[PDB]
A = this chain, B = another copy of it.
């Protein structure tokens, strides 16, 4: 039960990929502010998308036992789903290492979601970040996985 950064020293470096998603449920006030460009702090979706990419890179700094690794690819999508009154975020991270990047993809989505909140909380402090979850991951002995 003692914390440790699992010893992965003898494992081979293989191509890893991970995809996660997250949602931000909007209020009428927030949705209205969004379609108008935000609350004066700038474009919520634009800032949040970049925050996601930055977050993927800062993952090892935020998750204690997470292994530091060279990321080879980061894609982040932040879109407004009007009819549903919520923002959907998706992130796919890739690398060539001995451990997966599910943490990088999950963190990217979570931070992108927190940034959406920060960019809109002036309109409504009740916004909720919901369903941060993994959708896909490949590489590693356990192979392919998809929700």
* A interface list, Cβ under 8 A from B: 1-11, 15, 17, 22, 37-38, 40-43, 46-47, 49-51, 53-58, 60-77, 94-98, 102-103, 106-107, 110-111, 113-115, 117-119, 121, 125-134, 137, 142, 145, 147
| Chain B residue, CB-CB nearest to A96 | B9
| Chain B residue, CB-CB nearest to A10 | B15
| Chain B residue, CB-CB nearest to A142 | B125
| Copies of this chain assembled into the complex | 6
Asked whether, in the complex, the Cβ of B103 is within 8 Å of the Cβ of A118, the reply is: yes
| Chain B residue, CB-CB nearest to A147 | B126
Further contacts, 14 of them, CB under 8 A, given A3-B43, A64-B115, A107-B114:
A1-B46, A3-B41, A4-B75, A4-B76, A5-B53, A8-B73, A9-B72, A62-B62, A65-B118, A110-B111, A110-B129, A110-B132, A127-B134, A128-B133
